Short mmCIF file of C-alpha atoms and ligand atoms in Angstrom, two decimals:
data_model
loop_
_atom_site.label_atom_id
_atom_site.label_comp_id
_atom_site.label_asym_id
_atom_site.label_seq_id
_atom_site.Cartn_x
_atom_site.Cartn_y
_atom_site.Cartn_z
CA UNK A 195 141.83 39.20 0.37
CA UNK A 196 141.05 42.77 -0.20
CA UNK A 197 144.46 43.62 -2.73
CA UNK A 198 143.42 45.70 -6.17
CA UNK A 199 144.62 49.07 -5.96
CA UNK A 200 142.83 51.13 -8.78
CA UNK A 201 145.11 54.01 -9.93
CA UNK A 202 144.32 57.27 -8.33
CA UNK A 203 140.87 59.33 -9.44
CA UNK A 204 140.26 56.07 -11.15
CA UNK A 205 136.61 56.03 -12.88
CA UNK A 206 134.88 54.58 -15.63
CA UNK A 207 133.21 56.80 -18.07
CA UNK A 208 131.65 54.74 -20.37
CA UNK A 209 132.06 51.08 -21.95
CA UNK A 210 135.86 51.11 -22.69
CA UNK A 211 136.58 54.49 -21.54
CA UNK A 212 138.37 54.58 -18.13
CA UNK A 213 139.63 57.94 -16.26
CA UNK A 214 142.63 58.60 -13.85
CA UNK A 215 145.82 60.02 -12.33
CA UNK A 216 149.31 58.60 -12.81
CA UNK A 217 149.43 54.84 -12.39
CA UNK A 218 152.47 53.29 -10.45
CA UNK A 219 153.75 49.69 -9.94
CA UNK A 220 151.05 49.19 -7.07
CA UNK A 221 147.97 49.77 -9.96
CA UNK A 222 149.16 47.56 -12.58
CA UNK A 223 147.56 44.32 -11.12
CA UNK A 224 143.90 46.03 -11.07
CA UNK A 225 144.45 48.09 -14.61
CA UNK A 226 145.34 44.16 -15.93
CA UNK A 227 141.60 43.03 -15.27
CA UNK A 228 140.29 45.93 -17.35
CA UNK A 229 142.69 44.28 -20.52
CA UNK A 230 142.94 47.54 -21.59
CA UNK A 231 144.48 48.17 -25.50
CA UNK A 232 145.59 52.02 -25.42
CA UNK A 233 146.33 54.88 -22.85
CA UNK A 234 146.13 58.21 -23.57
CA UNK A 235 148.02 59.70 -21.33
CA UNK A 236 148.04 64.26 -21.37
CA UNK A 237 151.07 65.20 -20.12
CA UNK A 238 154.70 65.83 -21.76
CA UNK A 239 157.13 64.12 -19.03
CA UNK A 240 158.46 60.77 -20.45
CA UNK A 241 156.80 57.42 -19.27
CA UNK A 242 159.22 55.97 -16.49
CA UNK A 243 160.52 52.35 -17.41
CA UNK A 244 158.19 50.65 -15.01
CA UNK A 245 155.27 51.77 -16.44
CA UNK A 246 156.95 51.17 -19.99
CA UNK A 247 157.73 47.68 -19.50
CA UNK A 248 153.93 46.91 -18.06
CA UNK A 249 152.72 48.79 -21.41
CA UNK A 250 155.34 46.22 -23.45
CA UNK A 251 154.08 43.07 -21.41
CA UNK A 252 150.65 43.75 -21.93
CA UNK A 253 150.09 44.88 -25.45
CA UNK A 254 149.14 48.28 -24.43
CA UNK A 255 149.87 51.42 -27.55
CA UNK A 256 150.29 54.41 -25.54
CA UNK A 257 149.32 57.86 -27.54
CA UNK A 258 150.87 61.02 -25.59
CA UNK A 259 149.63 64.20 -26.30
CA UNK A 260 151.87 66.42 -23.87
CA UNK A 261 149.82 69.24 -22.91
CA UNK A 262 151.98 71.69 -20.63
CA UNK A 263 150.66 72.89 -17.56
CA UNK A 264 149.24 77.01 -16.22
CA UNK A 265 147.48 77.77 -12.99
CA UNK A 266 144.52 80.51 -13.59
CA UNK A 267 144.46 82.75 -14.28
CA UNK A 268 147.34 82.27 -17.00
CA UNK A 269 145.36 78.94 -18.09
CA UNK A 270 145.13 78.10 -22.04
CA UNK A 271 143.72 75.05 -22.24
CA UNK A 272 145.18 73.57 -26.12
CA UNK A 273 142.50 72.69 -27.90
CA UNK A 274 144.98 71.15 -30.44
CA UNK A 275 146.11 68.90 -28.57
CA UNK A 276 142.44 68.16 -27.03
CA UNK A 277 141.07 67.29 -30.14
CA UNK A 278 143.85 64.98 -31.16
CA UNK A 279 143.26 63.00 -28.03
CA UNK A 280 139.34 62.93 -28.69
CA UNK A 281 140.47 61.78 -32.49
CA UNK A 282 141.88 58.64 -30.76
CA UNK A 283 139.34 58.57 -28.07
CA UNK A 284 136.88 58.14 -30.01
CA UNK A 285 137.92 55.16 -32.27
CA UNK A 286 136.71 51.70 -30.88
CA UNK A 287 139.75 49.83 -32.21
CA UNK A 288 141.55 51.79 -28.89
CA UNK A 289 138.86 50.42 -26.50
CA UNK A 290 139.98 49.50 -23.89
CA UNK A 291 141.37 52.68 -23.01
CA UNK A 292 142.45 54.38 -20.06
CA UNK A 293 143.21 58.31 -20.15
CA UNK A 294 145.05 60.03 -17.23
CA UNK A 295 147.51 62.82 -16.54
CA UNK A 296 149.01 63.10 -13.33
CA UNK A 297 145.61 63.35 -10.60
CA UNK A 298 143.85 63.27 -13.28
CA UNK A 299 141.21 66.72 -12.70
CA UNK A 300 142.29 69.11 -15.24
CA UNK A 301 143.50 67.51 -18.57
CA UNK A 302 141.91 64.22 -18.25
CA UNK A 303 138.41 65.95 -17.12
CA UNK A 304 139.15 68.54 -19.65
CA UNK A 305 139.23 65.58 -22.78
CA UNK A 306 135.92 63.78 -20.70
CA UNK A 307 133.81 67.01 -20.47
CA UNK A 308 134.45 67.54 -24.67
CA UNK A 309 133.84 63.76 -24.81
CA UNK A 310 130.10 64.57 -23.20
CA UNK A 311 129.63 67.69 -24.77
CA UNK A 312 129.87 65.45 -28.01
CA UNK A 313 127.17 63.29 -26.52
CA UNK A 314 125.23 65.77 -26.58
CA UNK A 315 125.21 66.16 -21.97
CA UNK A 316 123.66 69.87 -21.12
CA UNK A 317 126.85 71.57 -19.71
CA UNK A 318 125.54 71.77 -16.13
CA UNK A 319 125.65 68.11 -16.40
CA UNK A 320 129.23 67.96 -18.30
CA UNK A 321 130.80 70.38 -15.08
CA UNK A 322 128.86 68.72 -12.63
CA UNK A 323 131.15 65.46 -13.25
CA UNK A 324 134.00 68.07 -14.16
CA UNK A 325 133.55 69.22 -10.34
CA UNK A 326 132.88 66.03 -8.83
CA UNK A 327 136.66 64.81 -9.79
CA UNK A 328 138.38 68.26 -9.13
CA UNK A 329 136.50 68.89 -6.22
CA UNK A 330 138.50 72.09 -4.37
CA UNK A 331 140.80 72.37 -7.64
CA UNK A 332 137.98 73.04 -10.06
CA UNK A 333 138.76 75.71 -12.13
CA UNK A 334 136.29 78.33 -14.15
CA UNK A 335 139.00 78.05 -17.33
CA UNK A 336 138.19 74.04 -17.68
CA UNK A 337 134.40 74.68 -18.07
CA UNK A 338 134.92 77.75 -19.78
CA UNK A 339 137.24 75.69 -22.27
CA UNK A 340 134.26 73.21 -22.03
CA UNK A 341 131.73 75.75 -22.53
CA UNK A 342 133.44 77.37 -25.87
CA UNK A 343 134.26 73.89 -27.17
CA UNK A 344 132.82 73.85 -31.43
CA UNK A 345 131.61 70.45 -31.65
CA UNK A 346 131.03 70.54 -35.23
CA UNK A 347 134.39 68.67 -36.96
CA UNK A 348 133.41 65.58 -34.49
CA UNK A 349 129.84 65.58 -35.54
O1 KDJ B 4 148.52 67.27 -12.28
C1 KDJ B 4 148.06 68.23 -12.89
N1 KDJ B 4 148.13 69.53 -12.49
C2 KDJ B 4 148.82 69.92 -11.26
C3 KDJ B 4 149.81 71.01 -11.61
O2 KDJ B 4 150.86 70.38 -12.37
P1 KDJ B 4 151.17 70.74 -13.83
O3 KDJ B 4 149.83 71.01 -14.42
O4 KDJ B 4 152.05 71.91 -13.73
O5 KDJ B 4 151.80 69.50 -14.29
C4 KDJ B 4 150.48 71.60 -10.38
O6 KDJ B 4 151.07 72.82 -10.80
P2 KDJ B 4 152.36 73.38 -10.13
O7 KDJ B 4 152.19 73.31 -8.66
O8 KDJ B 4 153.34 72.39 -10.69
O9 KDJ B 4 152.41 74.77 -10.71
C5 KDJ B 4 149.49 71.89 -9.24
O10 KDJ B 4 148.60 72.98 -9.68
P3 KDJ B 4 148.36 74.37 -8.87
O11 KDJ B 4 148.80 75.49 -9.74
O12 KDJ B 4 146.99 74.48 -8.30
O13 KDJ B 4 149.36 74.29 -7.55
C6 KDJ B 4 148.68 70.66 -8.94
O14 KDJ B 4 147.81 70.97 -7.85
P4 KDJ B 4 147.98 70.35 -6.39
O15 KDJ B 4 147.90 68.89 -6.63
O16 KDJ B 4 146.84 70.98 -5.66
O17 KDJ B 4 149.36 70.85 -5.94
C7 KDJ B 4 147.85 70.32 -10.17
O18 KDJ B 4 147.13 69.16 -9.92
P5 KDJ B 4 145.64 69.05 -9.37
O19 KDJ B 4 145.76 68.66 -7.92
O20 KDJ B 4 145.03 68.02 -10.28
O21 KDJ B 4 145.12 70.41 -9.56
C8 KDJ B 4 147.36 68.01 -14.21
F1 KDJ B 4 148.40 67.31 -15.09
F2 KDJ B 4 146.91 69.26 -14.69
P6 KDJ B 4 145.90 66.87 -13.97
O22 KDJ B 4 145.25 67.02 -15.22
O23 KDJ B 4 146.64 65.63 -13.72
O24 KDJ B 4 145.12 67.42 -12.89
#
């Protein structure tokens, strides 16, 4: 019976490193096989109760680093707030870990194209995956963010 829902824009980026939009109720049953320890999840609206009490029942931390939203061409990107995702990102001890926003193209590719750039991905590479989740919604100020991103205090 064909019955796991993966949340939406949901990808795997690399071992323990998942990718997506908001999950609801209908997700929680597939994002249980992946026995996932962390989210980090981008944006500053509260976590509704649902998702709350799967987080509780599962053993899942959830780090929130609310990064408000701007359509371009009034688009800054925080790095701030970037960087303190990658700081948690990027410790194993959080793996499994699942990062989303809301569709999950602009912060959450945002965090994943930094992620790359720190493994060392040429940046036609890094947007090429950028583009391939935000499809019509890419924007020029994510891979320009990407572009301008100092690796050096992860290195
Ligand atoms: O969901 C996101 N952004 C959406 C904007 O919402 P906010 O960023 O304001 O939360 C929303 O903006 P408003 O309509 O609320 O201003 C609109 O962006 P838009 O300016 O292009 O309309 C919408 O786009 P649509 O879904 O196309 O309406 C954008 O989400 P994406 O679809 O991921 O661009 C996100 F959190 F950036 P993501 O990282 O999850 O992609």
């Amino acid at each position: 019976e064909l019955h796991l829902i993966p949340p939406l824009n949901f990808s795997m980026v690399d071992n323990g490193i998942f990718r997506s939009g908001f999950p609801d109720s209908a997700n929680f049953s597939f994002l249980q096989t992946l026995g996932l320890r962390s989210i980090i999840y981008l944006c500053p609206e509260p976590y509704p109760e649902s998702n709350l009490q799967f987080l509780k029942s599962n053993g899942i931390r959830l780090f929130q680093f609310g990064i408000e939203g701007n359509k371009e061409p009034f688009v800054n990107i925080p790095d701030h707030k970037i960087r303190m995702a990658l700081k948690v990102l990027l410790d194993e001890k959080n793996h499994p870990v699942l990062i989303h926003s809301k569709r999950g193209k602009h912060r959450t590719g945002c965090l994943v194209g930094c992620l790359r750039k720190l493994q060392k991905w040429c940046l036609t590479s890094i947007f090429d995956e950028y583009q391939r989740f935000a499809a019509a919604k890419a924007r020029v100020s994510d891979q320009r963010f990407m572009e301008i991103f100092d690796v050096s205090s992860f290195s």
